[PDB]
Amino acid sequence: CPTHADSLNNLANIKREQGNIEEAVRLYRKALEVFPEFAAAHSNLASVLQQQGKLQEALMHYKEAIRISPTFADAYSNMGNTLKEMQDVQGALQCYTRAIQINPAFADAHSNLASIHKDSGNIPEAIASYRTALKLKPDFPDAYCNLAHCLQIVCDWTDYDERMKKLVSIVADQLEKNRLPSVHPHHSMLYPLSHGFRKAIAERHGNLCLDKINVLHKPPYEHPKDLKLSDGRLRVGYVSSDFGNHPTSHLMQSIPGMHNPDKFEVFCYALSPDDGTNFRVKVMAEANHFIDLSQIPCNGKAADRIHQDGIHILVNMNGYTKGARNELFALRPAPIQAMWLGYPGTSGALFMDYIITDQETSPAEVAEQYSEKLAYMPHTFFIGDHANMFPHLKKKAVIDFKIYDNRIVLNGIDLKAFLDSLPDVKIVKMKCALNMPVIPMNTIAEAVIEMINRGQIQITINGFSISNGLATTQINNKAATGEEVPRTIIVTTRSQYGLPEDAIVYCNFNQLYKIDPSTLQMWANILKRVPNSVLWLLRFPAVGEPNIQQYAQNMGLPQNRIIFSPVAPKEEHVRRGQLADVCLDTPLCNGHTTGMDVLWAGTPMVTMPGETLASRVAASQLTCLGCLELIAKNRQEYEDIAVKLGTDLEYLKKVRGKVWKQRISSPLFNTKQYTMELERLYLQMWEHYAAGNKPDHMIK
Numbered sequence: 027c028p029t030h031a032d033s034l035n036n037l038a039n040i041k042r043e044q045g046n047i048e049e050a051v052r053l054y055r056k057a058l059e060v061f062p063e064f065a066a067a068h069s070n071l072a073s074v075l076q077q078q079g080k081l082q083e084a085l086m087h088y089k090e091a092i093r094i095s096p097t098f099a100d101a102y103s104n105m106g107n108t109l110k111e112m113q114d115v116q117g118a119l120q121c122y123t124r125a126i127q128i129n130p131a132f133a134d135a136h137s138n139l140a141s142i143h144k145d146s147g148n149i150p151e152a153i154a155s156y157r158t159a160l161k162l163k164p165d166f167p168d169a170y171c172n173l174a175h176c177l178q179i180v181c182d183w184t185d186y187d188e189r190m191k192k193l194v195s196i197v198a199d200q201l202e203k204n205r206l207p208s209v210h211p212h213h214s215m216l217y218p219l220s221h222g223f224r225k226a227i228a229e230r231h232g233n234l235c236l237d238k239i240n241v242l243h244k245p246p247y248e249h250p251k252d253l254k255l256s257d258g259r260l261r262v263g264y265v266s267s268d269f270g271n272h273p274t275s276h277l278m279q280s281i282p283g284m285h286n287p288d289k290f291e292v293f294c295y296a297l298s299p300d301d302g303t304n305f306r307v308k309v310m311a312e313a314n315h316f317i318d319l320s321q322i323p324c325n326g327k328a329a330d331r332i333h334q335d336g337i338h339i340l341v342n343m344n345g346y347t348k349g350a351r352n353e354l355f356a357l358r359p360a361p362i363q364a365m366w367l368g369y370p371g372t373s374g375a376l377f378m379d380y381i382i383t384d385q386e387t388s389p390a391e392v393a394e395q396y397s398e399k400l401a402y403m404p405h406t407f408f409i410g411d412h413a414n415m416f417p418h419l420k421k422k423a424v425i426d427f428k429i430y431d432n433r434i435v436l437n438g439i440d441l442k443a444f445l446d447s448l449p450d451v452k453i454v455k456m457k458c459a460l461n462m463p464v465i466p467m468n469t470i471a472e473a474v475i476e477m478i479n480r481g482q483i484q485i486t487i488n489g490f491s492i493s494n495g496l497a498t499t500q501i502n503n504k505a506a507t508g509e510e511v512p513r514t515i516i517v518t519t520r521s522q523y524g525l526p527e528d529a530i531v532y533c534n535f536n537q538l539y540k541i542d543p544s545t546l547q548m549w550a551n552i553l554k555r556v557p558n559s560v561l562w563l564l565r566f567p568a569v570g571e572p573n574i575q576q577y578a579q580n581m582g583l584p585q586n587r588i589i590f591s592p593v594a595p596k597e598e599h600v601r602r603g604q605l606a607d608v609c610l611d612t613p614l615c616n617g618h619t620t621g622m623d624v625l626w627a628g629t630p631m632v633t634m635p636g637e638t639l640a641s642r643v644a645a646s647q648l649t650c651l652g653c654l655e656l657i658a659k660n661r662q663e664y665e666d667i668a669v670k671l672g673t674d675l676e677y678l679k680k681v682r683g684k685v686w687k688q689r690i691s692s693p694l695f696n697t698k699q700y701t702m703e704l705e706r707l708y709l710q711m712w713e714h715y716a717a718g719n720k721p722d723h724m725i726k
């Protein structure tokens with residue numbers, strides 16, 4: 027029997043599908059004023075307050091909802107979601123498990139439990155619960171799409187084509203119904219969705235920020251019109267949660283320090299607390315101003331602080347990644363706001379004006395896949411700090427064993443001083459002033475192999491510190507993470523990783539999720555045409571190794587053909603790429619950071635540009651490098667380019683020597699030049715705004 031609060035609850039549900047979130051709340055509260063013990067009203071209001079970002083208040087109502095109706099398993103699950111968003115993963119987990127125990131048929135709680143496992147790296151546990159969620163409720167888009175990504179992570183390609191079909195049809199059905207797509211924006215790059223579908227996904231998620239900032243009811247910020255208060259300097263704000271030991275900092279850590287202090291005032295806004303790593307230290311020490319916004323939880327106060335600093339250009343280095351606080355940009359504290367480096371896709375949001383890319387990564391004919399206006403960097407938008415982080419890899423030496431450049435390698439700052447102590451050093455000449463010192467198989471060379479084979483940490487030859495490449499973390503942990511430059515000479519051998527000392531080593535150090543059945547087949551074709559070659563992958567994660575292997579067997583590859591290695595420390599991982607001959611890039615989603623890593627080791631990378639931003643980064647890196655012959659227009663050209671490198675040893679030598687020189691000569695790894703080119707682009711943006719114009723494309 028309907029009461030007076032029961033009709034208000036019905037009316038408030040209508041205001042929820044109307045989008046009128048604010049009026050929905052008022053009607054819920056009026057219902058609770060009539061009926062204090064209305065469990066549904068408490069649950070519903072809390073579900074609305076949760077959207078608004080009023081978590082602590084929503085949580086309060088979820089408690090009441092449960093005290094009234096203890097069998098409200100639906101209220102338990104939603105309280106967990108709230109707690110989960112409040113970083114109380116422990117308490118959130120309890121809510122899901124309690125909900126499941128009250129109602130073992132309640133599918134949503136099973137999904138939410140799987141989500142906790144997924145976020146915590148427990149992929150098989152996530153998969154297991156997602157299947158349970160799906161077995162209870164077969165029409166469960168959230169559970170299906172999340173499971174799909176879990177299967178993607180560990181290379182479970184069971185019914186892959188059928189699955190890709192359902193993923194697309196799910197997003198299609200949801201977009202047509204104006205509902206939030208179950209595919210996350212950062213995952214849309216992995217599925218054969220429409221270019222339009224992906225942008226629409228980014229849009230829906232962008233609008234979730236608008237809901238969380240409309241509750242603040244903040245007036246639009248008044249933005250600067252000149253550089254008067256800034257003393258003629260452009261105030262650029264870099265917003266990231268990755269100031270520390272994170273891939274982002276590994277690329278751009280030098281950049282703030284290289285800005286021109288006569289025209290630019292750098293503001294680094296950290297969304298994460300100090301992790302003590304040297305990456306955080308460098309940025310803090312070199313940026314004109316470092317602001318820790320992790321100690322400013324409220325997006326309102328945070329955005330105020332940004333506006334109070336007088337930022338002209340605010341840079342989003344997160345997009346839709348972990349740790350992002352896009353509500354800051356939704357509040358628009360700056361007149362110009364651009365995406366950069368961090369997120370390999372469009373934000374799809376109104377509050378984002380430009381997207382810093384390049385002609386290669388985002389050609390002008392596919393600008394319709396972005397919501398933002400393109401802002402081309404000259405050569406490539408991608409940058410890496412490898413020049414600064416690993417200067418010990420700038421020059422190498424080898425050891426002979428009767429002459430290759432990837433069997434046994436020595437790197438070190440004092441390497442050339444060490445080679446002068448050795449009697450019979452042969453100097454092999456490269457071509458297109460460069461040289462590669464070779465050590466003959468003598469008592470000193472045998473002493474090094476001894477150290478490697480024995481598994482010793484390090485040895486001492488002529489007073490020099492000769493280190494084992496596998497034990498860098500036991501010698502200098504700072505040097506292993508790339509926080510410092512190794513102060514010893516490091517030995518890197520193929521024997522260390524189980525690599526055959528006479529085979530064409532094809533490597534790919536990307537996370538295994540970037541591989542799809544199409545790519546593995548493409549790689550198998552290459553391996554079959556190059557009989558004495560191996561594919562070198564990483565246990566990233568390790569559970570995906572049996573799957574990748576199994577599919578390789580089914581394509582006709584013996585087990586020995588693919589060699590796996592564990593994930594290494596940052597310094598080791600970059601350095602050990604020297605051991606490979608050719609790097610096979612993943613066409614579905616290019617190796618972005620990992621691509622810069624293999625190129626710094628002087629290893630040629632073969633790529634095939636797709637249509638998505640993520641699938642075109644490697645190509646952009648290679649064009650800037652100066653190696654257009656490592657780019658393929660289709661699958662056939664990909665396999666061909668690779669096979670040629672593994673069969674034509676002279677051609678391989680030329681290309682390897684090409685990468686080895688053009689990693690230094692080209693502007694690919696030049697952080698100073700990059701920063702200046704970035705500065706030039708910044709001014710083009712500001713001048714356009716100061717002219718009174720609205721954001722528009724930038725093609726130099």
Ligand SMILES: CC(=O)N[C@H]1[C@@H](OP(=O)(O)OP(=O)(O)OC[C@H]2O[C@@H](n3ccc(=O)[nH]c3=O)[C@H](O)[C@@H]2O)O[C@H](CO)[C@@H](O)[C@@H]1O
Nearest residue numbers: 273274367368369370537593594595596599617618619620
């Ligand atoms: C698809 C995607 O989201 N790409 C983003 C990702 O790059 P990318 O997709 O290249 O990178 P990942 O997040 O996989 O992590 C790569 C990191 O792993 C490290 N590693 C790898 C294997 C190893 O054995 N040891 C080791 O140290 C690499 O050194 C690198 O630092 O982050 C970059 C920096 O935020 C962004 O520019 C890219 O847009």
